[PDB]
Enzyme design. Structure first.
Site, short mmCIF file in Angstrom:
data_model
loop_
_atom_site.label_atom_id
_atom_site.label_comp_id
_atom_site.label_asym_id
_atom_site.label_seq_id
_atom_site.Cartn_x
_atom_site.Cartn_y
_atom_site.Cartn_z
N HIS A 154 -15.70 7.05 -11.49
CA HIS A 154 -16.92 7.46 -10.79
C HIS A 154 -17.20 8.91 -11.19
O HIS A 154 -16.33 9.77 -11.13
CB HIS A 154 -16.67 7.37 -9.28
CG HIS A 154 -17.92 7.25 -8.45
ND1 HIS A 154 -18.85 8.27 -8.31
CD2 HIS A 154 -18.36 6.22 -7.70
CE1 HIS A 154 -19.81 7.87 -7.48
NE2 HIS A 154 -19.53 6.63 -7.09
N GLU A 196 0.84 -1.20 0.00
CA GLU A 196 0.00 0.00 0.00
C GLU A 196 0.86 1.23 0.00
O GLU A 196 0.53 2.24 -0.67
CB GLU A 196 -0.94 -0.06 1.20
CG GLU A 196 -1.96 1.08 1.25
CD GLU A 196 -1.45 2.38 1.85
OE1 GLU A 196 -0.28 2.47 2.35
OE2 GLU A 196 -2.25 3.38 1.79
N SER A 224 -25.64 26.04 -19.32
CA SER A 224 -26.83 25.79 -18.48
C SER A 224 -26.61 24.55 -17.62
O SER A 224 -26.17 23.51 -18.11
CB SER A 224 -28.06 25.54 -19.33
OG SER A 224 -29.14 25.35 -18.43
N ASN A 230 -5.67 5.55 0.03
CA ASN A 230 -5.73 4.23 0.72
C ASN A 230 -6.40 3.17 -0.13
O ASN A 230 -6.88 3.49 -1.22
CB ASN A 230 -6.34 4.35 2.15
CG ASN A 230 -5.56 3.54 3.14
OD1 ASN A 230 -5.46 2.29 3.04
ND2 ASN A 230 -4.88 4.25 4.06
N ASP A 232 -30.21 -6.33 -5.49
CA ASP A 232 -29.37 -6.04 -6.70
C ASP A 232 -29.51 -4.59 -7.11
O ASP A 232 -28.51 -3.93 -7.45
CB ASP A 232 -29.74 -6.95 -7.87
CG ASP A 232 -29.20 -8.37 -7.75
OD1 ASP A 232 -28.49 -8.68 -6.76
OD2 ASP A 232 -29.49 -9.18 -8.68
C1 LIG Z 1 -1.12 6.44 -1.79
C2 LIG Z 1 -0.47 5.98 -0.92
C3 LIG Z 1 0.33 5.41 0.15
C4 LIG Z 1 0.28 6.10 1.53
N1 LIG Z 1 -1.08 6.19 2.08
C5 LIG Z 1 -1.17 6.74 3.31
O1 LIG Z 1 -0.14 6.97 3.98
N2 LIG Z 1 -2.37 7.02 3.78
C6 LIG Z 1 -2.60 7.57 5.12
C7 LIG Z 1 -2.55 9.13 4.96
C8 LIG Z 1 -2.61 9.92 6.30
C9 LIG Z 1 -2.56 11.47 6.04
C10 LIG Z 1 -3.79 12.04 5.30
N3 LIG Z 1 -5.07 11.58 5.89
C11 LIG Z 1 -6.12 11.23 5.13
O2 LIG Z 1 -5.98 11.21 3.90
C12 LIG Z 1 -7.43 10.60 5.78
C13 LIG Z 1 -7.37 9.80 6.93
C14 LIG Z 1 -8.50 9.17 7.53
C15 LIG Z 1 -9.83 9.24 7.06
I1 LIG Z 1 -11.55 8.18 8.08
C16 LIG Z 1 -9.88 10.05 5.88
C17 LIG Z 1 -8.75 10.68 5.25
C18 LIG Z 1 -4.00 7.17 5.57
O3 LIG Z 1 -4.92 7.11 4.70
O4 LIG Z 1 -4.08 6.91 6.78
C19 LIG Z 1 0.81 7.58 1.35
O5 LIG Z 1 -0.02 8.54 1.38
O6 LIG Z 1 2.05 7.75 1.22
CL LIG Z 2 -8.72 3.55 7.00
ZN LIG Z 3 -1.30 2.94 5.85
ZN LIG Z 4 1.17 5.00 5.22
#
Ligand SMILES: C#CC[C@H](NC(=O)N[C@@H](CCCCNC(=O)c1ccc(I)cc1)C(=O)O)C(=O)O
Ligand SMILES: [Cl-]
Ligand SMILES: [Zn+2]
Ligand SMILES: [Zn+2]
Ligand SMILES: *[C@@H]1O[C@H](CO)[C@@H](O[C@@H]2O[C@H](CO)[C@@H](O[C@@H]3O[C@H](CO)[C@@H](O)[C@H](O[C@H]4O[C@H](CO)[C@@H](O)[C@H](O)[C@@H]4O)[C@@H]3O)[C@H](O)[C@H]2NC(C)=O)[C@H](O)[C@H]1NC(C)=O
Ligand SMILES: *[C@@H]1O[C@H](CO)[C@@H](O[C@@H]2O[C@H](CO)[C@@H](O[C@@H]3O[C@H](CO)[C@@H](O)[C@H](O[C@H]4O[C@H](CO)[C@@H](O)[C@H](O)[C@@H]4O)[C@@H]3O)[C@H](O)[C@H]2NC(C)=O)[C@H](O)[C@H]1NC(C)=O
Ligand SMILES: *[C@@H]1O[C@H](CO)[C@@H](O[C@@H]2O[C@H](CO)[C@@H](O[C@@H]3O[C@H](CO)[C@@H](O)[C@H](O)[C@@H]3O)[C@H](O)[C@H]2NC(C)=O)[C@H](O)[C@H]1NC(C)=O
Ligand SMILES: *[C@@H]1O[C@H](CO)[C@@H](O[C@@H]2O[C@H](CO)[C@@H](O[C@@H]3O[C@H](CO)[C@@H](O)[C@H](O)[C@@H]3O)[C@H](O)[C@H]2NC(C)=O)[C@H](O)[C@H]1NC(C)=O
Ligand SMILES: *[C@@H]1O[C@H](CO[C@@H]2O[C@@H](C)[C@@H](O)[C@@H](O)[C@@H]2O)[C@@H](O[C@@H]2O[C@H](CO)[C@@H](O)[C@H](O)[C@H]2NC(C)=O)[C@H](O)[C@H]1NC(C)=O
Ligand SMILES: *[C@@H]1O[C@H](CO[C@@H]2O[C@@H](C)[C@@H](O)[C@@H](O)[C@@H]2O)[C@@H](O[C@@H]2O[C@H](CO)[C@@H](O)[C@H](O)[C@H]2NC(C)=O)[C@H](O)[C@H]1NC(C)=O
Ligand SMILES: C#CC[C@H](NC(=O)N[C@@H](CCCCNC(=O)c1ccc(I)cc1)C(=O)O)C(=O)O
Ligand SMILES: *[C@@H]1O[C@H](CO)[C@@H](O[C@@H]2O[C@H](CO)[C@@H](O)[C@H](O)[C@H]2NC(C)=O)[C@H](O)[C@H]1NC(C)=O
Ligand SMILES: *[C@@H]1O[C@H](CO)[C@@H](O[C@@H]2O[C@H](CO)[C@@H](O)[C@H](O)[C@H]2NC(C)=O)[C@H](O)[C@H]1NC(C)=O
Ligand SMILES: *[C@@H]1O[C@H](CO[C@@H]2O[C@@H](C)[C@@H](O)[C@@H](O)[C@@H]2O)[C@@H](O)[C@H](O)[C@H]1NC(C)=O
Ligand SMILES: *[C@@H]1O[C@H](CO[C@@H]2O[C@@H](C)[C@@H](O)[C@@H](O)[C@@H]2O)[C@@H](O)[C@H](O)[C@H]1NC(C)=O
Ligand SMILES: *[C@@H]1O[C@H](CO)[C@@H](O)[C@H](O)[C@H]1NC(C)=O
Ligand SMILES: *[C@@H]1O[C@H](CO)[C@@H](O)[C@H](O)[C@H]1NC(C)=O
Ligand SMILES: *[C@@H]1O[C@H](CO)[C@@H](O)[C@H](O)[C@H]1NC(C)=O
Ligand SMILES: *[C@@H]1O[C@H](CO)[C@@H](O)[C@H](O)[C@H]1NC(C)=O
Ligand SMILES: [Ca+2]
Ligand SMILES: [Ca+2]
Ligand SMILES: [Cl-]
Ligand SMILES: [Zn+2]
Ligand SMILES: [Zn+2]
Lengths: 694, 694
Positions: free
Chosen positions: B633, B370, B574, B465, B610
């Site tokens: 989406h 991830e 519009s 995520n 469904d």
């Molecule tokens: C893409 C990717 C990989 C990696 N993903 C993360 O680290 N994600 C983390 C990011 C934490 C900092 C920003 N927080 C959010 O985006 C967030 C956190 C919780 C919720 I409920 C909704 C939104 C996470 O979702 O907990 C990155 O951002 O480097």
């Molecule tokens: Cl989460």
């Molecule tokens: Zn994480």
């Molecule tokens: Zn992370």
């Protein structure tokens, strides 16, 4: 009882005859008032017949028409600019019509305007291989020339695209009697052959499954955003016009330059079939001049959509559809099919009035603007794509019921092979000499499978009719069936009077099917298929038949690649993944069939019916084929050289085509390997939809 | 009884604690042996816990790692080429670890290699608006400069893309104490703040929903065809490296050129925050030099996939997934989530051993890679897309369970709003002062909806995520929930120790959640959601909640457009069609809800289930958003300026963004109108999936 035999027995030849007569007295050209009036008639009748709802679904799509006060024609012009010969402004109308108005004169729909004048080059059928012969072998350059090509063998829009890419500044299409005049039969009105003044109308789109050229992806509804013409999808860039063989003789007789390379380039006219460019010595200074003034115009079209609600599974749709618009009277195309659909609706409605309903919902469609590139079916499917891809069981097309009187012709997904075989074994053959025999017996005798003893030929689906969006874009199991001739080299050319003014009720009643028994047989096949799809407890699809053909198609595409053994060595081109996927599909499909035979539980039944219904859907790649976003099926697509023909493993086939001519062999073979991976992955993913679900 | 209360009561804080400790003793970096060993452990344990099947699904994807024998660093270099200051080669390890090996030093994953040397420009958070301020207002040109930017506010890959488009030749990212040091708390190990030597790791992809950069569209299996690096999807083109605030102070303290334009550009360090370019008078001849030698490498990753087969609808899947790979120890990210998933699986397994099964199949996933751009979830969803789009009910994510201890945070599709409200009203609040009160009560008090009295805030989904592929590509209803802080301006910046070596078990046990009560609350919310989705007879989705938000989003996008009234007049822009579609959706959804409340018939039930399941799917456009084929989406997409944030009506929003700067206003407003038509059509088409089916 309300079973299939009750449905089939209610179908009557005499009703189909009455409907055909009713549908062919006046022209029903797409976008005209007459065609809208017929739509309203069918809507009213389907309601009377007992359907639950019948609505018109309209769209505003790009159509094309000649200019009534500035007619299209071609000339031979002299040094001074005198037009010394002109092609005809209209086909001599058939007897008793001669005072019908609003017969559209022959034209190529979607031709741009222009008045190009130049030297002629004759290009045979203007197929890919004919242009390869001209440019590569004969060293004749088509750039800046007007090409003249005979109709036949491939979709006319392929001819036009090929001529454009060769640099042609215009195309003249003509019907050679070699292709459109059967030896020993008389011209209309005394037989079913094309007269010298007859002309085949037809659109010349570079078909790419898009539907309305201005709204790819989305229905052409009231608020739709339209592309500008320059960005429109599928439109040709050079003027095009069709002519009959009397006129063609006058254009071809003066041709000089090179002799035809061989006899497969010679038709039946009394001319040399010289390839040109230009005319022989004495006439070297004469030119050919086209005058094309047709206009593309956004025009309203109307589909009729009838619903017969299912008793048990109303959210599962079996669709019987065919078009209603015609070039002129539509005696065969499409009204011989539409008359059959009308009698099918009437028969299902009779059962409905007695208290019966089918298990699943049946939708009936009378599509508009098929002749202008499948526009009505495609816009409706774009509008309703979410419903169709989650609920669509199958689509059965119903264009022309007859193109001959010899035997049955069927094109369908392998998922319906068993259904077709079983249904035809229970229908009576209408053929002379097979009284008391099954339709399967006569069909198998007259049109044997090239692969299997005691089995009939069933061909692959491509484009050219209204099933295209359902099968190639959406991945809904589809089929078509009609009565056909004994004339193999002509199976993509059309019957002699195809898209001519001479396609009338009298043509059918006098020369094709006086008793309407072939129409009745076709109604039994199409209607019987719809009955079984809509009423069988377990959907009548056999996944094992797909496994058999997938192996066939894999062997065939491997064999094409193996024409280049040194390159396959150099670039490590392996088909191992694809054969593995097909082997896995075979094994899994066998296990699924066992479970299907072995399960009172309606959840397991429907779970397994959903597996059957979504199996065709699994061959869809949401990214589409290369540069072809609307051809999404990975196993079949319309041939890139002939839209009427289906091609198997089309992504690999197109990557391999003419590969020895590509300038960067590394890149070209890399793309072959990419397509093998996509195909192997898709076959494995489709197989996995048949595994136990958890 | 085997009901939800039985499931929830079986969850224990003490087990989550034991699992968290077990998962955080050694690093579990994607593609390393330690992470594979943990995958095997989880597989074994989920089997022991009672799942029906637990398999590893592996893929070979592009990862990125520093070179162990050629470390990354940044220098200040003098006129002669002497490096007079160097940034740190590693973070001081936390107490009691200092002898752990294989701690990856701080680096920006997927940075290309290089040794650019140049003058610094400071760009605040390197947001779109920060670059607008620099170039448009301050007239500072970033071309050929190294930019230095503070982390925070937006996804770091957005910063990098913005710097590239500005012409920067490299990017230095740093953690300013303004954003990562809460006033009045101590640095780790004595509190939860970032020390001056701490550094935030993280990938810097230009995220476009593709997954593995080499295999967009298809799973990275054994026979996959890979793009070459130059054609790879999402890779940055300039070198990038992150540093802590001790090192940043040394780089920023010498900065000259212009003063910061205003106070929103100043962090908390004792430097001027001059924007540059380059250093003040005396040091004008010094430069900054980066040394980046990381390598991208195709590496095997492993997802654990556990199945608990449904008793009644085994072909319907409810998925609980979260990742297992970490940058170092993963004390919060992800193991606080993975420990929660482990205890959820254990609890469902306890019920299963007593003879219970959920109505629908539950899939549990421990995703890999991830941290390198959602690679494991995305490749698995690519492999299984056909199964997921025809069978996928919902996806609940389970990354970090805590990022604070103040209140609940939830992002989900409107289809789950009612479920979340109802579930939280039946759960106990863990918060001090709310003993005996519901979680809904404490959450609503602490995080009020900006729109509605007595309702809590729930935000929109974007990217960042593992839910992204399920929701934005496939259109499966998705949600996430965790415990969070009270720090609004910092909601996209991460907690102070985010992606640093200091994220340990001790951090959580000492400073976040000593009693594991917030972890337990989050397990109840995530597990309770999965329980209800997998067991409710009627799927717990309320289509009327989508109708409410669609009107909100339509009002908002109209309001943006109405900043340009003269252009809307000139180009006849519009929004009538879109408001019409939303009105129709509202009416149809109301009628569907009535029928849903008003029907012993399992076919009607499942037909209606469904309809509920496919409603999220109906917002998918198979053509994707412009230049974004994997964001399909139409109502939501990750913001083009901040991948962590969701944007509503993203196709229209991006067409309108900065439109006054476009050179061809006719073309630009034409594209706004096109996006309004696509959105109006999609909303109407989604509404029609809720109509009576026939
Ligand atoms: C893409 C990717 C990989 C990696 N993903 C993360 O680290 N994600 C983390 C990011 C934490 C900092 C920003 N927080 C959010 O985006 C967030 C956190 C919780 C919720 I409920 C909704 C939104 C996470 O979702 O907990 C990155 O951002 O480097
Ligand atoms: Cl989460
Ligand atoms: Zn994480
Ligand atoms: Zn992370
Ligand atoms: C047809 O279905 C069959 C299953 O009956 C399915 O077989 C699968 O094949 C894949 C690819 O061949 C196997 O993948 C192996 O998985 C093991 C672990 O299970 C790995 O250790 C292997 O990797 C090693 O070997 C590779 C090949 O030399 C090296 O490239 C690699 O670097 C490693 O050294 C390899 O990934 C998989 O186990 C089976 N699954 C089974 C038997 O259940 C086959 O893929 C299906 N066909 C298609 C086209 O999908
Ligand atoms: C919301 O649902 C409503 C249904 O409750 C749906 O209303 C539909 O609106 C369309 C477009 O406004 C209507 O289309 C009209 O259809 C009639 C025949 O039924 C035509 O004659 C009309 O065309 C004439 O008028 C046009 C407008 O001035 C001209 O441009 C045109 O050239 C013709 O002169 C027009 O096509 C349709 O009838 C209704 N359907 C109903 C009421 O059942 C609406 O479209 C839905 N909203 C969205 C965004 O889908
Ligand atoms: C086309 O017709 C053929 C011939 O009727 C159909 O195949 C037959 O289908 C039946 C029903 O599934 C099979 O019966 C089953 O046999 C097994 C014993 O092997 C038993 O376990 C089941 O209880 C059931 O009786 C029959 O074997 C099968 N015959 C053959 C030769 O395959 C076929 O299904 C029809 N195709 C359709 C409807 O698409
Ligand atoms: C969240 O909880 C609310 C409150 O329980 C649930 O709404 C309630 O749902 C029930 C069941 O559909 C509704 O009962 C129905 O009432 C009508 C009479 O109007 C009757 O015809 C039916 O037989 C049935 O008894 C009830 O009205 C409704 N309450 C409210 C205020 O809407 C809601 O469904 C839950 N959300 C979920 C499960 O996603
Ligand atoms: C071939 O036709 C041209 C053009 O005729 C015009 O357009 C036709 C479609 C038809 O509708 C005619 O009635 C139109 O007049 C003829 O050339 C024209 O001849 C007239 C009278 O001599 C002259 O005034 C026009 O300028 C000519 N127009 C040109 C050259 O464009 C030509 O005579 C016809 N040739 C033959 C052999 O019949
Ligand atoms: C900053 O570091 C440079 C480079 O040091 C090398 O790489 C580092 C990552 C680290 O691993 C060192 O051990 C390596 O030697 C230093 O410049 C080097 O100094 C040595 C000895 O004087 C010299 O032989 C090298 O050629 C230099 N390398 C260069 C200029 O690239 C520099 O001294 C360090 N500066 C400070 C202030 O510590
Ligand atoms: C595209 C389009 C519009 C229009 N479509 C047709 O005329 N279709 C006709 C084409 C008849 C000539 C070629 N025949 C076939 O392609 C064919 C006919 C029957 C079967 I069963 C399978 C294939 C038709 O499908 O009957 C056209 O080709 O101009
Ligand atoms: C085709 O058949 C239809 C249906 O019978 C005919 O339309 C009917 O015509 C009668 C007499 O004019 C009217 O009373 C009805 O209102 C029409 N019914 C409809 C339209 O449903 C039509 O006349 C026939 N066309 C031809 C050429 O014979
Ligand atoms: C995390 O917990 C697991 C599961 O208890 C531990 O792995 C077990 O270790 C024991 C003792 O070495 C072995 O007998 C088992 O075979 C292991 N079981 C598995 C892998 O399922 C692991 O030791 C713990 N890790 C830490 C850091 O405490
Ligand atoms: C269709 O043609 C109309 C008539 O064109 C005029 O008459 C012909 C015989 C030529 O001589 C031509 O040059 C004359 O202009 C046009 O008036 C009308 O624009 C055209 N209709 C279209 C384009 O839709
Ligand atoms: C990683 O780095 C290895 C060692 O590089 C050598 O030592 C460093 C300190 C520098 O002086 C450098 O110039 C030397 O070449 C390489 O041998 C190896 O190729 C690299 N590994 C990779 C690229 O995967
Ligand atoms: C064919 O004709 C034109 C002459 O105008 C020329 O531009 C083109 O390159 C020629 N191609 C070949 C292959 O001879
Ligand atoms: C109908 O069949 C007969 C007998 O084989 C044949 O002579 C006749 O021409 C057929 N009609 C058509 C249109 O093929
Ligand atoms: C910014 O910098 C470089 C100078 O090398 C130049 O090429 C570029 O056009 C400049 N742009 C502006 C807007 O000043
Ligand atoms: C836990 O909550 C308390 C009390 O509000 C607070 O002082 C403490 O810092 C919180 N811990 C974290 C990590 O936010
Ligand atoms: Ca369209
Ligand atoms: Ca991939
Ligand atoms: Cl047909
Ligand atoms: Zn037709
Ligand atoms: Zn036709």
């Amino acid at each position: 009882k309300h079973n299939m035999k009750a449905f089939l027995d209610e179908l009557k030849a005499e009703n189909i005859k009455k409907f055909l007569y009713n549908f062919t007295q006046i022209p029903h050209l797409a976008g005209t008032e007459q065609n809208f009036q017929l739509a309203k008639q069918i809507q009213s009748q389907w309601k009377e017949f007992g359907l639950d709802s019948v609505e018109l679904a309209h769209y505003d799509v790009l159509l094309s028409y000649p200019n009534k006060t500035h007619p299209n024609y071609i000339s031979i012009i002299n040094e001074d600019g005198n037009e010394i010969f002109n092609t005809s402004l209209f086909e001599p109308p058939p007897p008793g019509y001669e005072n019908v108005s609003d017969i559209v004169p022959p034209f190529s729909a979607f031709s741009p305007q222009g008045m190009p004048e130049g030297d002629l080059v004759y290009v045979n059928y203007a197929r890919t291989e004919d242009f390869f012969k001209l440019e590569r072998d004969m060293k004749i350059n088509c750039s800046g020339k007007i090409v003249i090509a005979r109709y036949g063998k491939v979709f006319r829009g392929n001819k036009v695209k090929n001529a454009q890419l060769a640099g042609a500044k215009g195309v003249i299409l003509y019907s050679d009697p070699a292709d459109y005049f059967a030896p020993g039969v008389k011209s209309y009105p005394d037989g079913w052959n094309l007269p010298g003044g007859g002309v085949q109308r037809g659109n010349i789109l570079n078909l790419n499954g898009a539907g309305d050229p201005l709204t790819p992806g989305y229905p052409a509804n009231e608020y739709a955003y339209r592309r500008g013409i320059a960005e429109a999808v599928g439109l040709p860039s050079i003027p095009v016009h069709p002519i009959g063989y009397y006129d063609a003789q006058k254009l071809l007789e003066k041709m000089g330059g090179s002799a035809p390379p061989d006899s497969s380039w010679r038709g039946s006219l009394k001319v040399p079939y010289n390839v040109g460019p230009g005319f022989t010595g004495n006439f070297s200074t004469q030119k050919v001049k086209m005058h094309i003034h047709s206009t593309n115009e956004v025009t309203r079209i109307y589909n009729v959509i009838g619903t017969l609600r299912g008793a048990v599974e109303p959210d599962r749709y079996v669709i019987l559809g065919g078009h209603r618009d015609s070039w002129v009277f539509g005696g065969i195309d499409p009204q011989s099919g539409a008359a059959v659909v009308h009698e099918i609706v009437r028969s299902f409605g009779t059962l409905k009035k007695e208290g019966w309903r089918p298990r699943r919902t049946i939708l009936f469609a009378s599509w508009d603007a098929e002749e202008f590139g499948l526009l009505g079916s495609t816009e409706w499917a774009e509008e309703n794509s979410r419903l169709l891809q989650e609920r669509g069981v199958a689509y059965i097309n119903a264009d022309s019921s007859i193109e001959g009187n010899y035997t049955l012709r069927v094109d369908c997904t392998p998922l319906m092979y068993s259904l077709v075989h079983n249904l035809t074994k229970e229908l009576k053959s209408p053929d002379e000499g097979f009284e008391g025999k099954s339709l399967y017996e006569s069909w198998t005798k007259k049109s044997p499978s090239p692969e299997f003893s005691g089995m009939p030929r069933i061909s692959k689906l491509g484009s050219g009719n209204d099933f295209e969006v359902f099968f190639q874009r959406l991945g809904i199991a589809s089929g078509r069936a009609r009565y056909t001739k004994n004339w193999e080299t002509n199976k993509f050319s059309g019957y002699p009077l195809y898209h001519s003014v001479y396609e009338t009720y009298e043509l059918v009643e006098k020369f094709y099917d006086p008793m309407f028994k072939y129409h009745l047989t076709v109604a039994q096949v199409r209607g019987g298929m719809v009955f079984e799809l809509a009423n069988s407890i377990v959907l009548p699809f056999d996944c094992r038949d797909y496994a058999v053909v997938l192996r066939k198609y894999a062997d065939k595409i491997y064999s094409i690649s193996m024409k280049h053994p040194q390159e396959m060595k150099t670039y490590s081109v392996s088909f191992d993944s694809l054969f593995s996927a097909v082997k896995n599909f075979t094994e899994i499909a066998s296990k699924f069939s066992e479970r299907l035979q072995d399960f009172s539980n309606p959840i397991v039944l429907r779970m397994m019916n959903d597996q059957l219904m979504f199996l065709e859907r699994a061959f869809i790649d949401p990214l589409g084929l290369p540069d072809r976003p609307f051809y999404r099926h990975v196993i079949y697509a319309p041939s890139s050289h002939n839209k009427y023909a289906g091609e198997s493993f089309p992504g690999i086939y197109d990557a391999l085509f003419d590969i020895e001519s590509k300038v960067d062999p590394s890149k070209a073979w890399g793309e072959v390997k990419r397509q093998i991976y996509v195909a192997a992955f898709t076959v494995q993913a489709a197989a996995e939809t048949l595994s136990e679900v958890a």
